[PDB]
Amino acid sequence: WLALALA
Amino acid sequence: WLALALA
Amino acid sequence: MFERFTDRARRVVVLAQEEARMLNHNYIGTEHILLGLIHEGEGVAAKSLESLGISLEGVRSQVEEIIGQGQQAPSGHIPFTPRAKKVLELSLREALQLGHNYIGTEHILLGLIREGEGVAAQVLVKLGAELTRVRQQVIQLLSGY
Amino acid sequence: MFERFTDRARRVVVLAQEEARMLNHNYIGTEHILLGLIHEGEGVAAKSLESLGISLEGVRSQVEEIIGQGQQAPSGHIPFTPRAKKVLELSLREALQLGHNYIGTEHILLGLIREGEGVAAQVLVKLGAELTRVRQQVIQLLSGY
């Protein structure tokens, strides 16, 4: 959270 | 921020 | 905040990343989230999409018109567009306003509609659906199971 | 929260990931942050480490004793250990308590010492340094430029 994948 | 790289 | 996401909501997210990969995009956009919502299956928004007359291959191809595959496959994670970022924000925000504290696939679809300004919404309207259409429809769905 | 990090603080972070890669670890630990602090160079904590008699190759080898290279190189990003997670938390927390709003390399070194329970601290004490040693020393440094 919140830039890519589950980040 | 805060699991890996610069996330 | 991704910990709130249901098993299948997260599965949508992982799937969106695979869709953007194998169609060779350097970003995950509102479209790719729609794609992952579909590709999910067993959960809410996927059945919701087969109901309001929206399928996978139509969205795939529509993206391959307005976007088209990329010359070079990307590897590693694929960043969200600010559109997709807002969709996920608003999916949270929908979820909270309907009272829940989890975030399921249906709540990502609602956030997607809330944004309504980007490719996901362009593709949707091009296929045969509407924003408050699918919104009130998926709200009726949360009322109908 | 990584946006607060200075150019060189972030460079430390990227470097820590490369260190954990080429020494074939599946996690970034307090050690690898020390490694990146060193490998940074032009900034504060690196000169601070060459002063209190701590070098790169010593830490590399010490890790190759207590850790040793991994059979298989990992690719993609490499997750932090909860130790490294706390170090970064506390680097923030140090930074704020010394008044600054950025987070530079020196503030990561201070957070590292604050944690003091993990491999970074074991390695340090094994090489010839102490926790409040380097703390008060780097505090004197922020007093001496």
Coordinates of C-alpha atoms in Angstrom, one line a residue:
Chain A
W1 CA 0.0 0.0 0.0
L2 CA -0.2 2.2 -2.2
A3 CA 2.6 2.1 -4.9
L4 CA 2.6 -1.6 -6.4
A5 CA 1.9 -5.5 -5.8
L6 CA 0.4 -5.6 -2.5
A7 CA 2.7 -2.5 -1.1
Chain B
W1 CA 7.4 1.7 3.6
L2 CA 7.7 -0.7 5.6
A3 CA 8.0 -4.2 4.0
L4 CA 10.9 -4.0 1.3
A5 CA 12.9 -1.7 -1.4
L6 CA 11.7 1.7 -0.7
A7 CA 7.9 0.4 0.1
Chain C
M1 CA -3.9 -0.8 4.3
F2 CA -3.9 -4.0 2.1
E3 CA -4.4 -6.1 5.2
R4 CA -8.1 -5.2 5.2
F5 CA -8.5 -6.7 1.8
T6 CA -10.3 -10.1 1.6
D7 CA -8.5 -13.1 0.3
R8 CA -10.3 -12.6 -3.0
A9 CA -9.8 -8.8 -3.1
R10 CA -6.0 -9.3 -2.8
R11 CA -6.4 -12.1 -5.4
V12 CA -7.8 -9.4 -7.7
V13 CA -4.8 -7.2 -7.0
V14 CA -2.3 -10.0 -7.8
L15 CA -4.3 -10.9 -10.9
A16 CA -4.3 -7.3 -12.1
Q17 CA -0.5 -7.3 -11.9
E18 CA -0.4 -10.5 -14.0
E19 CA -2.8 -9.0 -16.6
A20 CA -0.6 -5.9 -16.9
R21 CA 2.4 -8.2 -17.2
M22 CA 1.3 -10.4 -20.0
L23 CA -0.2 -7.6 -21.9
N24 CA 3.2 -5.9 -21.5
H25 CA 2.2 -2.7 -19.7
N26 CA 4.6 -0.7 -17.4
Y27 CA 1.7 0.3 -15.1
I28 CA -1.3 -1.2 -13.5
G29 CA -4.3 0.9 -14.4
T30 CA -8.0 1.1 -13.7
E31 CA -8.5 -1.4 -16.7
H32 CA -6.2 -4.0 -15.2
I33 CA -8.1 -3.9 -11.9
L34 CA -11.3 -4.5 -13.9
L35 CA -9.4 -7.4 -15.6
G36 CA -8.5 -8.8 -12.2
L37 CA -12.0 -8.4 -10.9
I38 CA -13.2 -10.5 -13.8
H39 CA -10.3 -13.1 -13.7
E40 CA -11.1 -13.6 -9.9
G41 CA -14.2 -15.6 -10.5
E42 CA -15.5 -17.3 -7.3
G43 CA -16.2 -13.9 -5.6
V44 CA -18.8 -11.1 -5.9
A45 CA -17.7 -8.6 -8.6
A46 CA -16.9 -11.4 -11.1
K47 CA -20.4 -12.8 -11.1
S48 CA -21.6 -9.2 -11.0
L49 CA -19.7 -8.6 -14.2
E50 CA -21.1 -11.7 -16.0
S51 CA -24.6 -10.5 -15.0
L52 CA -24.4 -6.9 -16.5
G53 CA -23.2 -8.4 -19.7
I54 CA -19.5 -7.8 -19.4
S55 CA -16.9 -10.5 -20.1
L56 CA -13.1 -11.0 -19.9
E57 CA -12.1 -11.2 -23.6
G58 CA -14.0 -8.0 -24.5
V59 CA -12.1 -6.0 -21.9
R60 CA -8.8 -7.7 -23.0
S61 CA -9.4 -6.7 -26.6
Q62 CA -10.7 -3.2 -25.8
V63 CA -7.5 -2.6 -23.9
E64 CA -5.5 -4.0 -26.9
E65 CA -7.3 -1.3 -29.0
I66 CA -6.9 1.8 -26.7
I67 CA -3.7 0.4 -25.2
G68 CA -2.3 -2.5 -27.2
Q69 CA 0.5 -4.9 -25.9
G70 CA 3.9 -3.4 -25.1
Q71 CA 7.1 -4.2 -27.1
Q72 CA 9.0 -5.5 -24.0
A73 CA 7.7 -7.5 -21.0
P74 CA 8.3 -5.9 -17.6
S75 CA 9.6 -7.8 -14.7
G76 CA 9.4 -7.2 -10.9
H77 CA 6.4 -5.4 -9.5
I78 CA 4.4 -3.0 -11.7
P79 CA 3.4 0.3 -10.2
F80 CA -0.2 1.6 -10.0
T81 CA -1.3 4.6 -12.1
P82 CA -2.7 7.5 -10.0
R83 CA -6.1 6.4 -11.3
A84 CA -5.6 2.9 -9.9
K85 CA -4.2 4.5 -6.7
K86 CA -7.4 6.5 -6.3
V87 CA -9.6 3.5 -7.1
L88 CA -8.0 1.6 -4.3
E89 CA -8.3 4.6 -1.9
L90 CA -12.0 4.9 -2.8
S91 CA -12.5 1.1 -2.5
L92 CA -11.4 1.5 1.2
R93 CA -13.7 4.5 1.4
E94 CA -16.8 2.7 -0.1
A95 CA -16.2 -0.3 2.2
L96 CA -16.2 2.0 5.3
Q97 CA -19.3 3.8 4.1
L98 CA -21.3 0.6 3.7
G99 CA -20.2 -0.2 7.3
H100 CA -17.9 -3.1 6.7
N101 CA -14.3 -3.1 7.9
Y102 CA -13.0 -5.7 5.4
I103 CA -12.6 -4.7 1.7
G104 CA -13.9 -7.3 -0.7
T105 CA -14.0 -7.5 -4.5
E106 CA -17.3 -5.7 -4.6
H107 CA -15.8 -2.7 -2.8
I108 CA -13.0 -2.4 -5.4
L109 CA -15.6 -2.4 -8.1
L110 CA -17.5 0.4 -6.3
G111 CA -14.3 2.5 -5.8
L112 CA -13.6 1.9 -9.5
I113 CA -17.0 3.4 -10.5
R114 CA -16.5 6.3 -8.0
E115 CA -13.4 7.3 -9.9
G116 CA -15.2 6.9 -13.3
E117 CA -12.8 9.3 -15.0
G118 CA -10.2 6.8 -16.4
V119 CA -9.8 3.8 -18.7
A120 CA -11.8 1.4 -16.6
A121 CA -14.9 3.6 -17.0
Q122 CA -14.2 4.3 -20.7
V123 CA -14.0 0.6 -21.4
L124 CA -17.1 -0.2 -19.3
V125 CA -19.3 2.4 -21.0
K126 CA -18.0 1.1 -24.4
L127 CA -19.0 -2.5 -23.5
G128 CA -22.6 -1.9 -22.4
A129 CA -22.8 -0.8 -18.8
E130 CA -23.1 2.3 -16.7
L131 CA -21.4 3.6 -13.5
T132 CA -24.3 4.1 -11.1
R133 CA -25.9 1.1 -13.0
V134 CA -23.3 -1.3 -11.7
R135 CA -23.0 0.6 -8.4
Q136 CA -26.7 0.3 -7.4
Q137 CA -26.6 -3.2 -9.0
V138 CA -23.7 -4.5 -6.8
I139 CA -25.4 -2.7 -3.8
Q140 CA -28.5 -4.7 -4.6
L141 CA -26.1 -7.7 -4.7
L142 CA -24.8 -7.0 -1.2
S143 CA -28.6 -6.9 -0.5
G144 CA -29.0 -10.3 -2.3
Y145 CA -26.7 -12.8 -0.5
Chain D
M1 CA 7.2 7.4 5.1
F2 CA 10.3 6.9 2.9
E3 CA 9.7 10.3 1.3
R4 CA 11.3 11.9 4.4
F5 CA 14.6 10.1 3.8
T6 CA 17.4 12.1 2.4
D7 CA 18.9 11.2 -1.0
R8 CA 21.7 9.4 0.8
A9 CA 19.4 7.8 3.4
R10 CA 17.5 6.2 0.6
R11 CA 20.8 5.3 -1.1
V12 CA 21.7 3.4 2.0
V13 CA 18.4 1.6 1.7
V14 CA 18.9 0.6 -2.0
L15 CA 22.5 -0.4 -1.1
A16 CA 21.3 -2.6 1.8
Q17 CA 19.1 -4.4 -0.7
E18 CA 22.1 -5.0 -3.1
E19 CA 24.2 -6.2 -0.2
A20 CA 21.6 -8.7 0.8
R21 CA 21.3 -9.8 -2.8
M22 CA 24.9 -10.5 -3.7
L23 CA 25.4 -12.2 -0.4
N24 CA 22.4 -14.3 -1.3
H25 CA 20.1 -13.5 1.7
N26 CA 16.3 -13.8 1.5
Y27 CA 15.9 -10.9 4.0
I28 CA 17.4 -7.5 4.6
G29 CA 18.5 -7.4 8.3
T30 CA 20.0 -4.9 10.7
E31 CA 23.5 -6.0 9.3
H32 CA 22.6 -5.2 5.7
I33 CA 21.5 -1.7 6.8
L34 CA 24.9 -1.3 8.5
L35 CA 26.5 -2.5 5.2
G36 CA 24.6 0.1 3.2
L37 CA 25.5 2.8 5.7
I38 CA 29.1 2.0 5.0
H39 CA 28.8 1.5 1.3
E40 CA 27.1 4.9 1.1
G41 CA 30.3 6.9 1.5
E42 CA 29.8 10.7 0.9
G43 CA 27.4 11.0 3.8
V44 CA 27.6 11.2 7.6
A45 CA 27.3 7.7 9.0
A46 CA 29.9 6.3 6.6
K47 CA 32.7 8.7 7.7
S48 CA 31.4 8.1 11.2
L49 CA 32.1 4.4 10.7
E50 CA 35.6 4.9 9.4
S51 CA 36.3 7.0 12.5
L52 CA 35.2 4.6 15.2
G53 CA 37.3 2.0 13.6
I54 CA 34.8 0.0 11.6
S55 CA 35.2 -0.9 7.9
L56 CA 33.2 -2.6 5.1
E57 CA 35.1 -5.8 4.6
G58 CA 35.1 -6.7 8.3
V59 CA 31.3 -6.5 8.4
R60 CA 31.0 -8.4 5.1
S61 CA 33.1 -11.2 6.5
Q62 CA 31.5 -11.2 10.0
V63 CA 28.2 -11.7 8.3
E64 CA 29.7 -14.5 6.2
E65 CA 30.6 -16.2 9.5
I66 CA 27.4 -15.7 11.5
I67 CA 25.3 -15.8 8.3
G68 CA 27.3 -17.0 5.3
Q69 CA 26.2 -16.7 1.6
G70 CA 23.0 -18.3 0.4
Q71 CA 22.9 -21.2 -2.0
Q72 CA 20.6 -19.4 -4.4
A73 CA 20.5 -15.7 -5.4
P74 CA 17.1 -14.0 -4.8
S75 CA 15.5 -11.7 -7.3
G76 CA 12.9 -9.0 -7.0
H77 CA 12.8 -7.0 -3.8
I78 CA 14.0 -8.5 -0.6
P79 CA 11.8 -8.0 2.5
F80 CA 13.0 -6.5 5.8
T81 CA 13.4 -8.5 9.0
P82 CA 11.3 -7.2 11.9
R83 CA 14.6 -6.1 13.3
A84 CA 15.3 -3.9 10.2
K85 CA 11.6 -2.8 10.3
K86 CA 12.1 -1.5 13.9
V87 CA 15.4 0.1 13.0
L88 CA 13.7 2.1 10.3
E89 CA 10.8 3.0 12.6
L90 CA 13.3 4.2 15.2
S91 CA 15.3 6.1 12.6
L92 CA 12.2 8.1 12.0
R93 CA 11.8 8.4 15.7
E94 CA 15.4 9.6 16.4
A95 CA 15.1 12.1 13.6
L96 CA 12.0 13.6 15.1
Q97 CA 13.5 13.8 18.6
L98 CA 16.6 15.6 17.4
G99 CA 14.2 18.1 15.8
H100 CA 14.8 17.5 12.1
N101 CA 12.0 16.5 9.8
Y102 CA 14.2 14.8 7.2
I103 CA 15.8 11.5 7.9
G104 CA 19.5 11.2 7.0
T105 CA 22.1 8.4 7.2
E106 CA 23.0 9.4 10.7
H107 CA 19.4 8.9 11.8
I108 CA 19.3 5.4 10.5
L109 CA 22.5 4.7 12.4
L110 CA 20.9 6.1 15.6
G111 CA 17.8 4.0 15.1
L112 CA 20.0 1.0 14.5
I113 CA 21.8 1.5 17.9
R114 CA 18.4 2.1 19.6
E115 CA 17.3 -1.4 18.5
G116 CA 20.7 -2.9 19.7
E117 CA 19.2 -6.4 20.1
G118 CA 19.9 -7.9 16.6
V119 CA 22.7 -8.8 14.3
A120 CA 23.8 -5.3 13.5
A121 CA 24.6 -4.7 17.2
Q122 CA 26.2 -8.2 17.7
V123 CA 28.5 -7.4 14.7
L124 CA 29.3 -3.9 15.9
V125 CA 30.4 -5.0 19.4
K126 CA 32.4 -7.8 17.8
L127 CA 34.3 -5.3 15.7
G128 CA 35.3 -2.8 18.3
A129 CA 32.5 -0.3 19.0
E130 CA 29.7 0.3 21.4
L131 CA 26.1 1.4 21.1
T132 CA 25.9 4.6 23.1
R133 CA 29.5 5.1 22.0
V134 CA 28.6 5.6 18.4
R135 CA 25.3 7.3 19.4
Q136 CA 26.9 10.1 21.5
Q137 CA 29.6 10.1 18.9
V138 CA 27.3 10.7 15.9
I139 CA 25.5 13.2 18.1
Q140 CA 28.8 15.0 18.6
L141 CA 29.1 14.8 14.8
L142 CA 25.7 16.5 14.2
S143 CA 27.3 19.0 16.6
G144 CA 30.5 19.1 14.5
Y145 CA 29.4 20.1 10.9

